[PDB]
Every structure is written in structure tokens, then in C-alpha cells.
């Protein structure tokens, strides 16, 4: 059955969603899970939203990712309208019409990080490491928790992901490369790929490593 979560809404507007979910007996939860089917996002008129964690995780889990307007229009027409008419089209970072949410729904058989091992390394802010890890895992990557734990082999593609400005004023995220054999990329590599549901090239996200 349907199971909704909401993102980017004023607890006012959350009020309307709660009233609507109560009216229709639709599961509404405050935390997104494997079972969530709909992530209801605040959008402008063209169904373009901001990127919140729930946004990424809705895309990563191939969920319906849908504008708040699906709820308000549905109330207005007293009928469960069609998600397709309200699917989020893009976000204010990666493009107003990149259609990630659709691609992710359509690509569960060819997940963008299939074949990758990813280590989410060093401090992060605003997104618990294990949610970043869940996000890559959803997208098909196998999750590695310590550098010394990358599986070796030429069939393995390791990647280290870091958020440089969560680090202490010391530039130690350039010395990760002497500790393992992988490319080292910013967290925006993940976030952009996930949003676009397309694996981006590392190139513009690589962090140079001291030898």
C-alpha cells in the first residue's frame, strides 16, 4: 500500500498532508524507510525542488518523488490524482528538468553504483554517515567502512568519498591516497550522480592526493 513522507514543507503545510492522509487512510510517517512509496516535496510551479536528504533517498530507492501539489490538487479535486502528473522534474542544483526521479524509477535493473565499493570517510555535516552509506547502497554500491577494508582485485572499483569542508583546518584529506589505492572524490560526486540518477565522471570531483 501507499506510504508517504514529506520534505521541505512548513508544519503548516504538513498539516494539510496529515489531514489528507487521515481522510484517505494513507500511511504517513515522519521518517523515510524501505517501505516508503511517496516522497512529497515542496516544489515551485514547474515541479522543481530543493535537495534534502529525503529527496536523495527517495530517488535512490526509486520511489515516487512527487510535488506537494499532488496533495493540494488532490484535495481540491477530492480524488487521488496521478503521480505522473506531479512527478518532480528537477532540482535547483542539477537542472530544472533532468528527470532523475523518473530515471531512478526506471533503472532498478541497472543501478548507477553497481560494481563500485564506496568508503564514506572522515567527518560529514548535516547528513549522518550511515544515511550517505544507505544512499550509495540503494544505488547498488557495496559499502566499505574502513580504508584498510577495500576488497582488492582488478574487478573491484574502490572510491573514497569525503566532504572537505567538514574537515579541521588541517588538509589531511590529501593524505588519504597513501593509505589506499582508490580515487578520492567530494560528496557532491555522490549527490549529483544520485540526483541525476546518472553516475557522473569523477574528474571534476577528484581531490588531488599527496604522494
Amino acid at each position: 500500500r501507499m506510504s508517504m513522507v514529506v520534505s521541505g514543507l512548513t508544519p503548516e503545510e504538513f498539516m494539510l498532508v496529515y489531514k489528507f492522509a487521515r481522510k484517505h487512510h494513507i500511511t504517513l510517517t515522519n521518517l523515510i524507510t524501505e517501505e516508503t512509496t511517496h516522497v512529497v516535496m515542496k516544489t515551485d510551479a514547474e515541479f522543481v525542488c530543493e535537495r534534502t536528504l529525503k529527496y536523495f533517498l527517495g530517488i535512490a530507492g526509486g520511489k515516487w518523488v512527487v510535488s506537494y501539489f499532488w496533495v493540494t490538487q488532490s484535495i481540491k479535486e477530492r480524488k487521488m490524482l496521478n503521480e505522473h502528473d506531479f512527478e518532480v522534474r528537477g532540482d535547483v542544483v542539477n537542472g530544472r528538468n533532468h528527470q532523475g526521479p523518473k530515471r531512478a524509477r526506471e533503472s532498478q535493473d541497472r543501478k548507477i553504483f553497481r560494481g563500485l565499493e564506496i568508503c564514506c570517510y572522515g567527518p560529514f555535516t548535516n547528513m549522518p554517515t550511515d544515511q550517505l552509506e544507505w544512499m550509495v547502497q540503494l544505488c547498488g554500491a557495496s559499502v566499505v567502512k574502513e580504508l584498510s577494508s577495500f576488497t582488492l582485485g582488478t574487478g573491484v572499483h574502490p572510491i573514497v568519498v569525503v566532504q572537505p569542508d567538514a574537515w579541521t583546518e588541517d588538509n589531511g584529506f590529501h593524505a588519504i591516497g597513501q593509505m589506499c589505492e582508490a580515487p578520492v572524490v567530494t560528496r557532491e560526486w555522490v549527490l549529483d550522480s544520485v540526483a541525476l540518477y546518472q553516475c557522473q565522471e569523477l574528474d571534476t570531483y577528484l581531490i588531488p592526493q599527496i604522494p
Partner: peptide, 6 residues
């Protein structure tokens, strides 16, 4: 309240 990622 929910963090945004720009």
C-alpha cells in the same frame, strides 16, 4: 529545519 544541499 531539514538541511538543504546546494
Amino acid at each position: 529545519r531539514s538541511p538543504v544541499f546546494s
